[PDB]
Design an enzyme around this catalytic site. Structure first.
Site, short mmCIF file in Angstrom:
data_model
loop_
_atom_site.label_atom_id
_atom_site.label_comp_id
_atom_site.label_asym_id
_atom_site.label_seq_id
_atom_site.Cartn_x
_atom_site.Cartn_y
_atom_site.Cartn_z
N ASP A 1 0.85 -1.19 0.00
CA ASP A 1 0.00 0.00 0.00
C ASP A 1 0.88 1.25 0.00
OD1 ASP A 1 -1.91 1.95 0.30
OD2 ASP A 1 -2.82 1.07 2.10
N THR A 2 1.13 1.81 -1.19
CA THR A 2 1.97 2.99 -1.28
C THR A 2 1.29 4.24 -0.74
OG1 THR A 2 1.24 3.43 -3.55
CG2 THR A 2 3.19 2.04 -3.25
N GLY A 3 -0.04 4.22 -0.61
CA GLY A 3 -0.77 5.30 0.01
C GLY A 3 -0.78 5.28 1.52
C1 LIG Z 1 -8.22 -1.25 2.75
C2 LIG Z 1 -6.88 -0.87 2.06
C3 LIG Z 1 -6.56 0.61 2.29
C4 LIG Z 1 -6.79 0.99 3.75
C5 LIG Z 1 -7.47 1.45 1.38
N1 LIG Z 1 -7.10 2.89 1.42
C6 LIG Z 1 -5.91 3.31 0.59
C7 LIG Z 1 -4.70 3.60 1.52
O1 LIG Z 1 -3.56 3.78 0.76
C8 LIG Z 1 -4.96 4.87 2.34
C9 LIG Z 1 -5.00 6.12 1.46
C10 LIG Z 1 -5.06 7.35 2.41
C11 LIG Z 1 -3.80 8.17 2.70
C12 LIG Z 1 -3.86 9.38 3.65
C13 LIG Z 1 -5.18 9.76 4.32
C14 LIG Z 1 -6.45 8.93 4.04
C15 LIG Z 1 -6.39 7.73 3.09
N2 LIG Z 1 -3.85 5.04 3.26
C16 LIG Z 1 -3.97 4.70 4.68
O2 LIG Z 1 -5.03 4.44 5.17
O3 LIG Z 1 -2.77 4.68 5.44
C17 LIG Z 1 -2.90 4.71 6.92
C18 LIG Z 1 -1.96 3.91 7.42
O4 LIG Z 1 -0.61 4.79 7.32
C19 LIG Z 1 -0.96 6.06 7.46
O5 LIG Z 1 -0.57 6.76 6.43
C20 LIG Z 1 -1.83 7.48 5.78
C21 LIG Z 1 -2.90 7.21 6.55
C22 LIG Z 1 -2.52 6.09 7.46
S1 LIG Z 1 -8.45 3.98 1.43
O6 LIG Z 1 -8.04 5.38 1.39
O7 LIG Z 1 -9.20 3.89 2.69
C23 LIG Z 1 -9.44 3.53 -0.04
C24 LIG Z 1 -9.10 4.17 -1.39
C25 LIG Z 1 -9.92 3.78 -2.63
C26 LIG Z 1 -11.06 2.76 -2.50
O8 LIG Z 1 -11.79 2.42 -3.67
C27 LIG Z 1 -12.71 1.35 -3.58
C28 LIG Z 1 -11.38 2.12 -1.14
C29 LIG Z 1 -10.56 2.50 0.09
#
Ligand SMILES: CC[C@H](C)CN(C[C@@H](O)[C@H](Cc1ccccc1)NC(=O)O[C@H]1CO[C@H]2OCC[C@H]21)S(=O)(=O)c1ccc(OC)cc1
Lengths: 99, 99
Positions: free
Chosen positions: B25-27
């Site tokens: 998960d690069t996000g």
């Molecule tokens: C279920 C897999 C994962 C949690 C999904 N996420 C993408 C992540 O890349 C998300 C993308 C994200 C990035 C920043 C802020 C909100 C969401 N990053 C994230 O939650 O990371 C957390 C853990 O490390 C910390 O760094 C950032 C937040 C913390 S998401 O944003 O909730 C998401 C994006 C698109 C979707 O389409 C169906 C469904 C869910």
């Protein structure tokens, strides 16, 4: 190009005539953009991650330009804290993970 | 290896001697794993996702193996919908984005 992951993979995108910064997100099935007023019809949707769910508006066949690479597909718009480029568009620009 | 994104970038990881499936998960800034028992000390922490903030247990300097690549760093354990490998560990295995 090649993007390292020391910092957030933020890149400039072009959508609906606007330039924005977005996260190249391999963990996002779909593309979720911060609230904006796009034209055309849409369908409600809810997407879940850490913290629960948010309500979004699904737009279909939206052109996005990512670092000069053109892509067209589904775009979700809602109260996301960050613009997120998901796999549905990352494939269209030839993006890969490599290690 | 080179990983295309037409499917979720899921991989098998090893932590605490146990095998699991996790999402590259690069996000994600940090690595967050579903509820599990991990040896050692931990301190309460909070992380925010797209849907809000959650309470997690922070384990520091944890050994974790991703597709035969070793990493040692912080692992958060809490009610995440999916085991996600964040940039804190993706950098340790030399992971880059390329298009
Ligand atoms: C279920 C897999 C994962 C949690 C999904 N996420 C993408 C992540 O890349 C998300 C993308 C994200 C990035 C920043 C802020 C909100 C969401 N990053 C994230 O939650 O990371 C957390 C853990 O490390 C910390 O760094 C950032 C937040 C913390 S998401 O944003 O909730 C998401 C994006 C698109 C979707 O389409 C169906 C469904 C869910």
């Amino acid at each position: 190009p090649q993007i390292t992951l020391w910092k957030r993979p933020l890149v400039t995108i072009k959508i609906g005539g606007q330039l924005k910064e977005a996260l190249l997100d391999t963990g996002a099935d779909d593309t979720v953009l911060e609230e904006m007023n796009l034209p055309g019809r849409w369908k409600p949707k809810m997407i879940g991650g850490i913290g629960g769910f948010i309500k979004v508006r699904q737009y279909d066949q939206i052109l996005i330009e990512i670092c000069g690479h053109k892509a067209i597909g589904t775009v979700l718009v809602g109260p996301t804290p960050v613009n997120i480029i998901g796999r549905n568009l990352l494939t269209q620009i030839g993006c890969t993970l490599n290690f």
